[model samples]
Target: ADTIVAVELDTYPNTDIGDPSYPHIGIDIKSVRSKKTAKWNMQNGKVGTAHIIYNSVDKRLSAVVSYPNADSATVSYDVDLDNVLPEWVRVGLSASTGLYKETNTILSWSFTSKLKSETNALHFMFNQFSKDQKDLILQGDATTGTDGNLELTRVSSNGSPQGSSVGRALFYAPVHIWESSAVVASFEATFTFLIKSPDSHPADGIAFFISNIDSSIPSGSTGRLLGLFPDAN
Candidate 1:
């Protein structure tokens, strides 16, 4: 449960939890109860900047948030990410305005990592496919539509099977995952998806999987299986 490490800028005060009464920035380890907090006033209509740095050697995560008028707050904590997160991780920003009518906009951002970029990275947008991009293998009901989307299952209303369906879209080629079975590879993938259900009870579900490059959808795999595992029954 102690997997999350976050830098949060909370504008509203929660009296029940006794957080800082004033707007503040804080470092949160596993829980919302910030390990450390700094009072920094950030008013509406004014842009602010935040810098979050982590020193792996010292296992220190530090944050400095500042406004145009030199108002700022600095907070830090020591926690090795190796103990807090998995070897592969995703880095991104998230914001919520809650019940307020305020809006938070990210004008610009950048990120740098000490490790070198891997040569076997697969990056693609479904909408931007070209003719020569033959790396994709669409199987079962998987198909790319004119609406710039990948349809993993045959839609019922569009004259396809209504029950028990499966689709898989895989990379045509395989990458090195081992050197004489020593296990020598790691990866991080990011994807966005939307699940649409016309009624209260939706079809089983959907999933993303990694399998042998020659793998195929198992026979009788549908409903709760979500297209994975052998269906013995």
Candidate 2:
């Protein structure tokens, strides 16, 4: 069996900054209620926002910390973990743009371990979007098969705090698309901004399990993926 260990890292400024760094590394796990309220449990009593950095030269790691308002962000020096795994892991991120609105974002990263190959199943659960933003946000006019199963359009940029506001989140899952027999392996997830939106509150995005089933799953207006089943209310 593969040994499981917990490692802690800090956030970096250029890596964790708002925009232009399209597709940042790391997985962004979110809470059900307030997206801004989401906090990372760093070592010691220090609880705050978390960000990660990846060094392509030596393949090391770094991190940074920031407040909910996007101020006082700081970064750490290069720390190596090259001997940890054989593959590059997935990274992802999610952001909450507005305030006083029920709109919240959700991001999940999942992969099977080599140790529990047969019993290893990747499952993720997320909350619904706020009922308030349902009517306010606009849905993309793109269609599946015609344009793409998933289409990213109409993105905006962030003006203040030296980061782009492109309020949406981008995700990438490597193992999900691979066909392999390895019992345990490392996968990767990534996130980036598509465009900026004028609407202060933006609901979260979604990932799906598509097969022979129809693409008619009734995802919620802004953030939530209504239900797992296509016709589920």
Candidate 3:
């Protein structure tokens, strides 16, 4: 419910599982240390608020949800027909160890979605996903390892010399296969990927690319080729 839902978290335990499915617009804590601030509860009138706190000194993260009428603010978590949560969702501030687990200290939280009209959109915060969820995404044969909250990138196994991998495109909107760049003046894209290898064996830096007609990466294209541009004719 967008209506105000004040939540309180007094304490939690390490073995807890916030939601066996995964994290999405929810509060949680893990072995690692981190902190964040976000706004929620768009559909509801009052909207929920969160004040998160954490660091190495305390060894835990606290998310305080501020809402006066906790009970009336209770709205169910949203999910798609496939059980996938939308890019965002709203929840009442919870006193129990629901969204997060493992720690010492009372906590509070309140959450809401982006907007009722903004439903059906997809978003990813890597570490917040489970292995099963990640399995559904399409990727290249040579790609290795699970991604995390910080970044998601494909890399070949450590010892392969001629290794190459391609990740499936993540489309936020429709595109013309051979559309001219100058014709699409209002397009915008935001991407974050990390590339890493042994210092002595560095390869091309990462790229957030755009294309249409030649969507497929040409065979053996790597480094400068970028799977799109071929060598000088």
Candidate 4:
């Protein structure tokens, strides 16, 4: 019922004369599948802003998504993500990070709220482009591909980046998303995943984690951590 929660375009490297779009902000929607919210593809040089404000009443989660090569054009959308019987999780809003958790893992979560990182550098790799892979390329190991898709789980059996070559955030000090000092929170995690065992004896158990740094494969980690935690602990 309240429209005060609207989003505005915040630019980076504030200089204009860019993007050949409808011009008001800068990048236009469907701007060639180039979703440059400055997550990974381009940092310091990326465009627009990213801060989410979700409306629990309307089930609407809005964000300040933008593109850059110079932020001269802009637009917004209600689109998101998808995949197979995949499990998913997220720890915070997109513009913030915390000391405990990181990344978007379908049903993954965390504590002491604050704005979320533009993208979790641990679970996902640095945002970049590969004409060969042809995708937006975000991963803990490989390129994204031309299809602009996101790779969640590991493609290799050892759970390493398929390539012998593997792969691997933001900003200044700010605020904590967690504000309720004397209250318990209510939450839910919805997940649908594809287990590897095609034979149907899918005994590979899945693991969950909470960390003090960005999300990534823990050191000397394996099935014991559900592939999440590390032996260093």
Reference-based lDDT, each prediction: 0.48, 0.24, 0.25, 0.24
The numbered model that scores best in TM-score is 1
**TM-scores, in order shown?**
0.49, 0.26, 0.32, 0.29
Instruction: Give the residue spans of candidate 4 off by over 4 A.
Output: 1-151, 156-180, 199-203, 207-209, 213-215
Candidate order by decreasing TM-score: 1, 3, 4, 2
lDDT of 4: 0.24
Question: Which residue pairs in model 1 clash with each other?
Answer: none
Model 1 Cα lDDT, one tens digit per residue, 154-209: 65554332445556565554533323222223332223322333333234333333
Which parts of model 3 are misplaced by more than 4 Å? 1-145, 149-168, 176-185
Please report, as a residue range, the 10-residue window in candidate 1 with the lowest summed lDDT: 96-105
Per lDDT, the best of the predicted structures is 1
In candidate 4, what are the lDDT values of residues 82-191, reduced to their tens digit? Answer: 11001222331111011211111122112222222231222222243233532122333322332332233334444222211212211112212222331111122112
**How far does residue 205 in candidate 3 sit from its true spot (Å)?**
2.3
Model 3: per-residue Cα lDDT over 116-227, one tens digit each: 2212222322223333433323223222233322112233344322333322322323222111211111111222222223333333222223333123444543332222
Ten contiguous residues minimizing lDDT sum, candidate 4 = 93-102
Q: Give the TM-score of candidate 2.
A: 0.26
